[PDB]
Amino acid sequence: LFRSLVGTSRAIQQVRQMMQQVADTDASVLILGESGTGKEVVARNLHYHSKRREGPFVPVNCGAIPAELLESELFGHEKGAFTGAITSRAGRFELANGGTLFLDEIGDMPLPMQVKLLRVLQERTFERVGSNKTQNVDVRIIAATNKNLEKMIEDGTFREDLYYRLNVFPIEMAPLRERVEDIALLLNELISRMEHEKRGSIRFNSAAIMSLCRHDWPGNVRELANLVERLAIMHPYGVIGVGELPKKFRHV
Numbered sequence: 001l002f003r004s005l006v007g008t009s010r011a012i013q014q015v016r017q018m019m020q021q022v023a024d025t026d027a028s029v030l031i032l033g034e035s036g037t038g039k040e041v042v043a044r045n046l047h048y049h050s051k052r053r054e055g056p057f058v059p060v061n062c063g064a065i066p067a068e069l070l071e072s073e074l075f076g077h078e079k080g081a082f083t084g085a086i087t088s089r090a091g092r093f094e095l096a097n098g099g100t101l102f103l104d105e106i107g108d109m110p111l112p113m114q115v116k117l118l119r120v121l122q123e124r125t126f127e128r129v130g131s132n133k134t135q136n137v138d139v140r141i142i143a144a145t146n147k148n149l150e151k152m153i154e155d156g157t158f159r160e161d162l163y164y165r166l167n168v169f170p171i172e173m174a175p176l177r178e179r180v181e182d183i184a185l186l187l188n189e190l191i192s193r194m195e196h197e198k199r200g201s202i203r204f205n206s207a208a209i210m211s212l213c214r215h216d217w218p219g220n221v222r223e224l225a226n227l228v229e230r231l232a233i234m235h236p237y238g239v240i241g242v243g244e245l246p247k248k249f250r251h252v
Ligand SMILES: Nc1ncnc2c1ncn2[C@@H]1O[C@H](COP(=O)(O)OP(=O)(O)OP(O)(O)=S)[C@@H](O)[C@H]1O
Pocket: 003, 004, 005, 006, 007, 033, 034, 035, 036, 037, 038, 039, 040, 041, 042, 189, 221, 222, 225
């Protein structure tokens, strides 16, 4: 379903309270933060605590999709619309109807698609590729990004009108290095996940934890999770001390 946002930091306690406020509303939510800072966790929780909780949760990875197939991927197509179209699609939007659409890295959505997304947010309608059957769509938008959208507006790479439409309820995720007090609790959570799934077990002694609390965590919680996995393989059911950490994680 959805996992919980572990932590005792002021910043994370804020996020939970903001989540509870906006969740069972239909406001568009924009979640900002570095890679691996729990942005999808926040999005999934928002959904399953929402009026749409029994509806579908439909991700769109704005980075991945090739722009040639992008409009098609998001809005579907009747067959004939272009080449090779001999089986048809409802787009990610139609698939999300009565549910939540999670736009992962909205900063990577190309300008022409930003315009079409604004239409959905405004007119709540859309066109399948090559069609004129203006179908209506009933989705809640949650978007996430690690980019500086306001700068992109200035650069002309992101639309101001879309921005103000999407950024009704922003939620900022603090990077791990700004919430180091949470690292021990995160470890406990990550190790407990690992045990539940028969994938191993470790624990960290206080020396190791101190050193981890001084790490920069450019990959944030996903990097933290990666280190836990690796240490469980190298030292199964072992205790991790400063010496068992890789050199880049030692800070003494
Ligand atoms: N506060 C948290 N409590 C528990 N698990 C967390 C927390 N923050 C992140 N995680 C976990 O850390 C991993 C990465 O979190 P995600 O939500 O996928 O990150 P993200 O911000 O969406 O980064 P990207 O854009 O997908 S790289 C997942 O396995 C999450 O379950």
